[PDB]
Design a protein around this ligand. Structure first.
Ligand code: TA1
Ligand code: GTP
Ligand code: ANP
Ligand code: GDP
Ligand code: MG
Ligand code: MG
Lengths: 360, 440, 429
């Protein structure tokens, strides 16, 4: 029908240091496991190897040593191939949400991806190629400017993080996690308490706030990367609005735009250090599983009787920011190099759980 | 020499090892304290026991074993029981909780705390061996330790040794009987290590051995001791060729050459035919023909699968006792005449035969009777795939709702892996459906 | 090596703990003085699980007694086994909670929680390896419920990766010794659902029914109910202390019993229970224990399992027995009563076996069920809670101790969500 929860998957382009280092075998190595067939259809680990017949004959009932098939057919609500730039990604993914946020209903964006996948490029980007966040908030401020007449709008920015099932205000540190408690107001609004709500007046102020918040994010060394993040960062923009010259009254309408940068799944990778690292990884994996279960239950019409919102703090915080009323989009960023092969598959599987489209 | 190193992972493996080493000590005349009295009585120097024991200067015999578990209870029972003085004191325990029945805890978090000690002890044992033949790994698919730690250990062994044989004597989950809710997850996640690293995996389910004990041995209340004793008899019959002379000796390499047609089809079914009570030891001739026919009956199989629903791709018979080759030839001809035992068209020969002159030794207080003849049959057949398919169904019933998955992902495991292993199992099943089809 | 730190809170928890330590001391041969006068080596093989060694060949139980009034502490000290406990582990205040959750959780309990946690840390750091904790208390009370929840939360913060059991005595619908039971029970269930791995629900009504019907006792007292709960508690942790054919620790039970992280409210029971003058009329075998375990009347939580579906079950047997008999009996129970078991779990019954039966009995078994019927208890509490909260019957006693009505609303919503979650797995699918 419509199924408001939508999945858009973006394939990173090969870096210059990647192609020359890897493409030698084609003329690690450049297998290019990801291959886009259509805007809703891709292949993972295809039989694109040219000298494959000599063993594909053995794959038949002649010699049972390579009969395993890893060619995976994947179907998603939207795809972005190597040549896709940022502008049309912003148009297809987050631009319609700006209507809903201004219509009265909330909106939600997730950003998921493993290490070396290009998530930071997509959400943040560079000063010359701004990411999705900058474009979205710039368009929001623009639409405020056009709608300045006959309607007054206020913007409230908050930015928190979830870490080991505890909440931390990024913009107001040295606050006890016990103070930041999730509630449920009678008007179906979550509004976690004791958050330093800021009223930026321009997109530049929003980006500055995002930078100071990222400065306080929880990261750790001694992994595949020395800054891979260990927590789910949630940025909420409350758009309040009321009529200027019309029915001037205390009543008003307000909505929320949520943007969630998710920490990738963890496999320990024999971290002899372990220690907190294990607990952090376990909590991250449990939160990801809870979010996946919530999304799958929302997309499934049979299990709509109960959705496990209470399983994790992240799911509880977005109790009224995932359902049919709210618009949810999910940006899954994957890399085409074999160096991250298994990781990419895991990421793709996490994208598949949202809607099991078996009828390709 | 013909050394073999036995590894016992988990409670099931350790108790099977207790039975196995009881049987070996009785077979070779070694006392529970490690002293063989034949050296003081006869003089020694004319015996073959290097396959399972190492001599010291004092005359003591130390078994070539590595008892490993993630809890102390079972190993402490071994260290306090009758055989406390037999084994070397280096029996490995993690000084913490066990895997608690999940693959992730025993593979990623707790299993990596004692892996180095196990590999070091295996290195020390292998260094003492001049003619090491292979490894005999005992564990259970359903257990957390027996799955996760076995997977880790076999990965390390394949990396380090590689060319040496590795035999899996595992306990597979039964179709209906079970003793844990999360058996399907642990068993499915063990597919990779038992498919890619093991060279020949023997699978047995308790239900079949319970039925054998009920019907053959006339025991209405069997316990795990009897099951372990039967499995010990099987392993002894397998390894008898390395220890005693015989008309047709069959070592591990010849066995694998004759039984494994393709690298992936290495999951045979084991059978001990002449299992009978002492009361029924009489009233029966138990000649070679009767025992060989008894091997093929679907009731006597030790995995709940019907060979009639598949094709016998290969078979190896290992006889013990008063057996002549002509009797075995007549028995094989009688089997080949039968129509219900269907063989694949691309294996006209079919049967490998080995004969040994040492009859089986009865353990006092056991169930099996003293028999002049015995045989162990190991058959690679396509029916075993059915035993997997049932398990796969169970896995699906738990994985649709992601039940118990949070326990696994909270111990350093990705959610996607659950699917991947399942796919591997499915692929394996397809192979077992493709080998059996007749040629064009 | 798998050390358990036992914590007692409130009158009910302290009494159950005293009886529990009497039972365990009898099991391991420890005398009231603390010296070991047993007759089997196995009893000393795992004495370290519950006891700490002391210089003059003594065994001090690793127990922590907590309260906010000294009367129960004096009663336990004057008891037959009072001399076995460590005097430094008796932590108590002077002003009681007044059967008020707020006093025991915010004002009066917050002062004593620091001392209790100091003693808890001192006990924990002496363990070679800590399996987890084990709390006994009652949610319908004051100091017991509030202190238990506060200690649970703080210990969970300090020891996030350790098992946290809880033997909580639920309020009965019929039996009621307090008027403000629903508020305390709701505010305690709001905390237990978030910060525990296992919660063994016990109800005084069910224990009284067991005493009247199964045991045919004429005048049961709290001693008999504590005896039943003691038998349950000893049965749960039997594989840690004695060898068996199939071992099962607390973590293994937590893994098998719990399908989803919030469904950890278990229904306990003890298998051999008969009158004094009726043991001679029955053979003690595995089918008898099996059919007594799954019987409705033997449950200790005041629920009918026939009104729901068993999400999962565990049976921990004790004695010399055949694994075939146990497996066949569990399979037969599953097949015969397939209506009361969820279809999306192929095997709902975990089995564990121990080789050392309790002194006296030739055989025994402990049942730990996990079924949807437990939701009924919560529903009953809600049926009272709202009835006291729409009109705010006794709310000022709670708001006078710094509490807000928002906490009441959050607790009610959380319990309702738990009930809905349990109900979701009741419809056939
Ligand atoms: C002559 C005879 O057979 O004596 C039995 C007995 O008559 C019965 C009725 C016993 C008896 O129990 C009761 O009458 C009883 C009363 C109130 C509450 C609970 C039980 C017995 O008291 C209980 C006692 O049980 C034990 O000794 C266990 O080890 C038990 N420990 C204690 O009861 C205990 C004793 C002294 C100090 C502290 C505790 C136990 C149970 C589970 C786990 C660990 C320990 C036994 C053998 C008996 C008597 C004495 C009459 C029963 O006991 C249990 C708990 O299994 C009740 O039904 C069983 C079956 C027995 O046949
Ligand atoms: N045949 C046989 N099977 C056994 C024996 N002991 C245990 N098992 C099997 O083992 C399975 C349970 O897994 P275990 O191997 O005991 O688990 P574990 O290896 O101790 O690892 P943990 O779960 O961490 O304790 C059961 O399904 C039993 O059927 C035995 O003595 N003989
Ligand atoms: N669409 C794109 N076009 C051009 N270069 C890109 C694109 N996406 C990613 N890159 C480049 O590819 C590299 C990896 O992307 P990047 O966004 O830095 O991932 P990352 O954030 O550093 N890894 P991680 O921190 O674990 O998410 C960088 O050099 C990016 O500039
Ligand atoms: N089993 C048992 N239950 C008790 C005992 N004393 C009280 N209770 C139950 O616990 C409730 C009272 O709780 P209480 O122990 O007084 O809480 P506290 O005062 O805060 O410690 C009552 O409703 C009783 O049903 C006891 O000795 N044994
Ligand atoms: Mg980066
Ligand atoms: Mg074990």
């Amino acid at each position: 029908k419509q199924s408001s929860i939508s999945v858009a998957v973006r394939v990173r382009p090969f870096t210059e240091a990647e192609s020359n280092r890897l493409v030698k075998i084609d003329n690690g190595g450049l297998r290019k496991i990801i291959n886009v067939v259509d805007d809703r259809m891709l292949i993972f680990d295809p039989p694109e190897t040219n000298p494959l017949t000599k063993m594909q004959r053995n794959a038949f009932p002649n010699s049972f040593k390579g009969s395993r098939i890893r060619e995976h057919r994947f179907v998603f609500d939207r795809l972005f191939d190597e040549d896709c730039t940022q502008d049309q990604v912003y148009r297809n993914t987050t631009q319609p949400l700006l209507d809903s946020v201004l219509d009265g209903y909330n909106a939600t964006v997730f950003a998921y991806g493993a290490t070396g996948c290009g998530k930071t490029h997509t959400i943040s980007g560079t000063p010359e190629d701004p990411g999705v966040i900058f474009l979205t908030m710039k368009e929001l401020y623009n639409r405020i400017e056009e709608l300045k007449d006959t309607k007054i709008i206020d913007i409230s920015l908050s930015y928190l993080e979830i870490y080991n099932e505890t909440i931390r205000d990024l913009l107001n540190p040295m606050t006890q996690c016990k103070n930041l408690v999730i509630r449920e107001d009678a008007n179906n609004k979550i509004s976690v308490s004791n958050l330093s709500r800021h009223r930026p007046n321009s997109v530049e102020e929003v980006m500055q706030l995002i930078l100071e918040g990222n400065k306080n994010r929880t990261c750790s060394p001694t992994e595949a990367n020395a800054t891979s993040s260990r927590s789910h960062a949630v940025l909420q923009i409350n758009v309040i609005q009321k009529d200027r010259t019309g029915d001037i009254t205390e009543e008003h309408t307000f909505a929320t735009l949520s943007i969630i940068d998710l920490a990738g799944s963890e496999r320990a990778a024999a971290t002899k250090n372990r220690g907190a690292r294990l607990n952090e990884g376990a909590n991250i994996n449990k939160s990801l599983l809870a979010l996946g279960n919530c999304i799958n239950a929302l997309c499934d019409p049979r299990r709509r009787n109960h959705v496990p919102y209470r399983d994790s703090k992240l799911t509880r915080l977005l109790k009224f920011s995932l359902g049919g009323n709210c618009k949810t989009v999910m940006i899954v960023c994957v890399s085409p190099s074999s160096q991250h092969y298994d990781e990419t598959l895991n990421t793709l599987k996490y994208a598949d759980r949202a809607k099991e489209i078996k009828t390709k | 020499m013909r050394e073999c190193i036995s590894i016992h992972v988990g409670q099931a493996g350790v108790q099977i090892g207790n039975a196995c080493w009881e049987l070996y000590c009785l077979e070779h005349g070694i006392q529970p304290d490690g002293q063989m009295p034949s050296d003081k009585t006869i003089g020694g120097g004319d015996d073959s026991f290097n396959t399972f024991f190492s001599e010291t200067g004092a005359g003591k015999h130390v078994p070539r074993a590595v008892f490993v578990d993630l809890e102390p209870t079972v190993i402490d029972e071994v260290r306090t029981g009758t055989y406390r003085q037999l084994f070397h004191p280096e029996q490995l325990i993690t000084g913490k909780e066990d895997a608690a029945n999940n693959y992730a805890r025993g593979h990623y978090t707790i299993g990596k705390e004692i892996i180095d000690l196990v590999l070091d002890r295996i290195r020390k044992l292998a260094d003492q061996c001049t003619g090491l033949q292979g490894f005999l790994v005992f564990h259970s698919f359903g257990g957390g330790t027996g799955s996760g730690f076995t997977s880790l250990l076999m990965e390390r062994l394949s990396v380090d040794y590689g060319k040496k044989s590795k035999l899996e004597f595992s306990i597979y989950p039964a179709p209906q009987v079970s003793t844990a809710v999360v058996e399907p997850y642990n068993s499915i996640l063990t597919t990779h290590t038992t498919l890619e690293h093991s060279d020949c995996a023997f699978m047995v389910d308790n239900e079949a051995i319970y039925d054998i004990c009920r019907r053959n041995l006339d025991i209405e209340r069997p316990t795990y001791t009897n099951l372990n004793r039967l499995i010990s008899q099987i392993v002894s019959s397998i390894t008898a060729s390395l220890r005693f002379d015989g008309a047709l000796n069959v070592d591990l390499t010849e066995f694998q050459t004759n039984l494994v047609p393709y690298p992936r089809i290495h999951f045979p079914l084991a059978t001990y035919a002449p299992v009978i009570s002492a009361e029924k030891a009489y009233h029966e001739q138990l000649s070679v023909a009767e025992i060989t026919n008894a091997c093929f009956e679907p009731a006597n199989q030790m995995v709940k699968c019907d060979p009639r629903h598949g094709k016998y791709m290969a078979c190896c018979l290992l006889y013990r006792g008063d057996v002549v080759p002509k009797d075995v030839n007549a028995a094989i001809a009688t089997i080949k005449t039968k129509r219900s035992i269907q063989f694949v068209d691309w294996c006209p020969t079919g049967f490998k035969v080995g004969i040994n002159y040492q009859p089986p030794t009865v353990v006092p207080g056991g169930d099996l009777a003293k028999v002049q003849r015995a045989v162990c049959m190991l058959s690679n057949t396509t029916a075993i795939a059915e035993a997997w398919a049932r398990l796969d169904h169970k896995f699906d019933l738990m994985y649709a709702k992601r039940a118990f998955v949070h326990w696994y992902v909270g111990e350093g495991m990705e959610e996607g892996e659950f699917s991947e292993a399942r796919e591997d199992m499915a692929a394996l099943e397809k192979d077992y459906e493709e080998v059996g089809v007749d040629s064009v | 090596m798998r050390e358990i730190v036992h914590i007692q809170a409130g009158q009910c928890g302290n009494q159950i703990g005293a009886k529990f330590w009497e039972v365990i001391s009898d099991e391991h041969g420890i005398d009231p003085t603390g010296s070991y006068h047993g007759d089997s080596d196995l009893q000393l093989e795992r004495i370290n699980v519950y006891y700490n060694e002391a210089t003059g060949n003594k065994y001090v139980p690793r127990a922590i007694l907590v309260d906010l009034e000294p009367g129960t502490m004096d009663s336990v000290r004057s008891g037959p086994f009072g001399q076995i406990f460590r005097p430094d582990n008796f932590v108590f205040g002077q002003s009681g909670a007044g059967n008020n959750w707020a006093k025991g959780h915010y004002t009066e309990g917050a002062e004593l929680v620091d001392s209790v946690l100091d003693v808890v840390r001192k006990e924990s750091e002496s363990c070679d390896c800590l399996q987890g904790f084990q709390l006994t208390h009652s949610l319908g009370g004051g100091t017991g419920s509030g202190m238990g929840t506060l200690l649970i939360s703080k210990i969970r913060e300090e020891y996030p990766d350790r098992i946290m059991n809880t033997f909580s005595v639920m309020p009965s619908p019929k039996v009621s010794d307090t008027v403000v039971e629903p508020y305390n029970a709701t505010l305690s269930v709001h905390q237990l659902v978030e910060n525990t791995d296992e919660t063994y629900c016990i109800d005084n009504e069910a224990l009284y029914d067991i005493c009247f019907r199964t045991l045919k006792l004429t005048t049961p007292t709290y001693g008999d109910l504590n005896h039943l709960v003691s038998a349950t508690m000893s049965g749960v942790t039997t594989c840690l202390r004695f060898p068996g054919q199939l071992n099962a620790d607390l973590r293994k039970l937590a893994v098998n019993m719990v399908p989803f992280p919030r469904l950890h409210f278990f229904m306990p029971g003890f298998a051999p229970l008969t009158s004094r003058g009726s043991q001679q009329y029955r053979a003690l075998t595995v089918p008898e224990l099996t059919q007594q375990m799954f019987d409705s009347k033997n449950m200790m939580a005041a629920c009918d399992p026939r009104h729901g579906r068993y999400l999962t079950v565990a049976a921990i047997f004790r004695g010399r027995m055949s694994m075939k008999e146990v497996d066949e009996q569990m399979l037969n129970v599953q097949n015969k009563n397939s209506s009361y078991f969820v279809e999306w779990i192929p095997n709902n019954v975990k089995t564990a076996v121990c080789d050392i039966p309790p002194r006296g009995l030739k055989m025994s078994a402990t049942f730990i069920g996990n079924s949807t019927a437990i939701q009924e208890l919560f529903k009953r509490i809600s049926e009272q809670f709202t009835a006291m909260f729409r009109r705010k019957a006794f709310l000022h006693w709670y708001t006078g101790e710094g509490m807000d009505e928002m906490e009441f609303t959050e607790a009610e919503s959380n319990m309702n969500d738990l009930v809905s979650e349990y109900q979701q797995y009741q419809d056939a699918t």
